[PDB]
């Protein structure tokens, strides 16, 4: 069972430098007297590490509290312990650290290690209540107060203790590295004596692999485990703990890096070189040696990276005559369909989509927000006046009088149907009967089939011969379009736009957003389909009115015409190059200089 | 979005089919993600388990 402590009070972190530690064997192969390069998760040389006291005294009274904040676990963690009296006991790993996500617990008592993977319900302040025996005192007895409950256990492991017994300045380093890759949780370990070094000591010691765990769980945050020998019920004034917590622990975070390790003859990692630390290190990487001779060497290649992209489009008030069709005064009858075509002109579908005046938008095959994105070979506009309840009949694969007897709609549309109410423009008080509808036909119609024949249909067996009578009706009936009529009978103005998407030239395109011109900074540009990278500058050349391109002596294009306002712009790739390191012999000094070939020093 | 290889997602969050947020409640353009099927001995070969 768990027992609650006092608040952590959010103590400010403390930082300290790490001097070339944490190198672990990346693989399981024996290699002798060879320099080998590896790209893997490492701890950078001369990095920041955060340091926590095991027991901290910050209150004026002399309060002793356990510094055990939760810490992020981002892709490997290096844990170093400066310790002398066996106070740390284990670790916990998870995302939520509760009964909601799978959790990992490693503990170490005086006998062995316990590795457990279950759905533990942890308390806010896990610890191990430890005490000595009244006679022997050789070993410490531990009571677990780490979790409340454990369920759904999928792993168990026991082996030799991870922490050697520490039972008066004989401080030692215990260095561990945890990684979690491909569902495998790898622990690399090392133990080392030290003297009179409070921080991480300057030196080098490899990390050998200790254990691999087929856990396969997901880890984001972790917490260390500490042993309370004191009485949480009755805290002493002082000296109940351990000299105000001299023993403590340092945490560092790994990230992907490339190293050069030097295997000696025995196979022991004796030195390593970080590759991106400083230019001399980059030279040692590129030359693949531990020592660099005097001279000049080419190591890397400098290159400016564009930060943004630009796309450009023309500048014309004239466009597709959508306004003249949608806002037209008169619209044809619904059984003699006026079909219009729009071509060789630019379409702005955002005017129609964002108008917030059209009652129905129904696009099939193309999303309505990408209507301006795509280029269509042709667009057919059909604009008529239909009753409200029959607006639903205008869609692929539907039935009804208009759907069947008027105009069949195929099931493979790539186009849009748009409708807006026309009560105040089409209806009159006395009834507008200028739109005629047929209710009887011999058979259902073909897709995109127009019939205007006015022959009187034969409902019975006797022939009509173009004359009404018994079982003989004229095809077209009138609608009572009135401003007082209901929703189903009021007139709605409907336009269908069918887009032709074939392997054919595109005459209808969306200018989209004419991205404002941003020059004198090499950007990713896309002019009328040309995609490239480079800097745009004003140029005094003159293109012919039909010419859109400018070519160098080679195939590389240089100057492009601005569709908005001509003033030809010219393109220049933005200053690539190469970095050289000027250094003397490394046995003299490690100071270096950097030279950037073929570029001045403003973009560096 | 499409998923990473061998990636396990167990979330039961109600997806937002529209622009309005669902906030874990079904409704308009809001649905539970999982659907079940009538695995039956009389179904066609294409629909057999």
């Amino acid at each position, epitope marked *: 069972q768990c027992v609650n402590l006092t608040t952590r009070t959010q103590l400010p972190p403390a930082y300290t430098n790490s001097f070339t530690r944490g190198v672990y064997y990346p693989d399981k192969v024996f290699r002798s007297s060879v320099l080998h390069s590896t790209q893997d998760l490492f701890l950078p040389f001369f990095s920041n590490v955060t340091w926590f006291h095991a027991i901290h005294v910050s209150g004026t009274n002399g309060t002793k509290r356990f510094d055990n904040p939760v810490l992020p676990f981002n892709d490997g963690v290096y844990f170093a312990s400066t310790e002398k009296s066996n106070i740390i006991r284990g670790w916990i790993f998870g995302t939520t650290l509760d009964s909601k996500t799978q959790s990992l617990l490693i503990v170490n008592n005086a006998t062995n290690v316990v590795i457990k993977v279950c759905e533990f319900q942890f308390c806010n302040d896990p610890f191990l209540g430890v005490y000595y025996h009244k006679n022997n005192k050789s070993w410490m007895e531990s009571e677990f107060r780490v979790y409340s409950s454990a369920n759904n256990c999928t792993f168990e492991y026991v082996s030799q203790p991870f922490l050697m017994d520490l039972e008066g300045n004989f401080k030692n380093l215990r260095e561990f590295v945890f990684k979690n890759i491909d569902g495998y949780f790898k622990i690399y370990s090392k133990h080392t004596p030290i003297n009179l070094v409070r921080d991480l000591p300057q030196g080098f010691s490899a990390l050998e692999p200790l254990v691999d765990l087929p856990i396969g769980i997901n880890i984001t945050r972790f917490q260390t485990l500490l042993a309370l020998h004191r009485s949480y019920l009755t805290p002493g004034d002082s000296s109940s703990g351990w000299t105000a917590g001299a023993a403590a622990y340092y945490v560092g975070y790994l990230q992907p890096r490339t190293f050069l390790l030097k295997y000696n003859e025995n196979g022991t990692i004796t030195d390593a070189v970080d590759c991106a630390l400083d230019p001399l290190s980059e030279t040692k990487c590129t030359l693949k040696s531990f020592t660099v001779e005097k001279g000049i060497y080419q190591t890397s290649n400098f290159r400016v990276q564009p930060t943004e992209s630009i796309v450009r489009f023309p500048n014309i008030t004239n466009l597709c005559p959508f306004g003249e069709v949608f806002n037209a005064t008169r619209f044809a009858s619904v059984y003699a369909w006026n079909r219009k075509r729009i071509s060789n002109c630019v379409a702005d579908y955002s005017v129609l989509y964002n108008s*917030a*005046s*059209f*009652s*129905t*938008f129904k696009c099939y095959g193309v999303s*309505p927000t990408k209507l301006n994105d795509l280029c269509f070979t042709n667009v057919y506009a059909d604009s008529f006046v239909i009753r409200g309840d029959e607006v639903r009949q205008i869609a692929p694969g539907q039935t009804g009088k208009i759907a069947d007897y008027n105009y069949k709609l195929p099931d493979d549309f790539t186009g849009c149907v748009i409708a807006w*109410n026309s*009560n*105040n423009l089409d209806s009159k008080v006395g009834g507008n009967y200028n739109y005629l509808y047929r209710l009887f036909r011999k058979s259902n119609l073909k897709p995109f089939e127009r019939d205007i024949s006015t022959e009187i249909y034969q409902a019975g067996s006797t022939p009509c011969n173009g004359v009404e009578g018994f079982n003989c009706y004229f095809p077209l009936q009138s609608y009572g379009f009135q401003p*007082t009529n*209901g*929703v189903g009978y009021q007139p709605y103005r409907v336009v269908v736009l069918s887009f032709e998407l074939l392997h054919a030239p595109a005459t209808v395109c969306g200018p989209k957003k004419s991205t404002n011109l941003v020059k004198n900074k090499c950007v990713n540009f896309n002019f009328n389909g040309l995609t490239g990278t480079g800097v745009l500058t004003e140029s005094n050349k003159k293109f012919l009115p039909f010419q859109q391109f400018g070519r160098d002596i080679a195939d590389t294009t240089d100057a492009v015409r601005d569709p908005q306002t001509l003033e030809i712009l010219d393109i220049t790739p933005c200053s690539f190059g190469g970095v050289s390191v000027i250094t003397p012999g490394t046995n003299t000094s490690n100071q270096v200089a950097v030279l950037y070939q073929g570029v001045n020093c403003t973009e560096v | 979005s499409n998923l990473k290889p061998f990636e396990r997602d167990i979330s039961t969050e109600i997806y937002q089919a*529209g*622009s*309005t947020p669902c906030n874990g409640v079904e*409704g*308009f*353009n809001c649905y539970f993600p999982l659907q079940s099927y009538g695995f039956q001995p009389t179904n066609g070969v294409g629909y057999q388990p």
Partner: nanobody
Amino acid sequence: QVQLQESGGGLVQPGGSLRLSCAASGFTLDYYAIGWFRQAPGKEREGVSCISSSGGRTNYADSVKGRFTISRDNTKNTVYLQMNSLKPEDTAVYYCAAWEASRWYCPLQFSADFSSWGQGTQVTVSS
């Protein structure tokens, strides 16, 4: 993609209660003022109950005063009308509409054109 969808309609007993809900998809319904309308068999579409954009102004038909209450959730973008003491006179095809105020003044008592219309639900009261 602007859609208004009504729901909750059906058959109820006279003197009973019913609740009707219209939702907006493809656009935000908070900006618009919302009116609930009905059309009875053989009658014209009359104004039942209107609510403002912010919900601070409401208007009711005199036939439904003291029986119907209109409300709105701008967070859930949904407009509700609660019916109490329903009568056979209330059987109608029932629509939700959204529009912006066409006249000066806060009150929504006056009528105008209505921008967006749903398909509606049937409300039948008979026993």
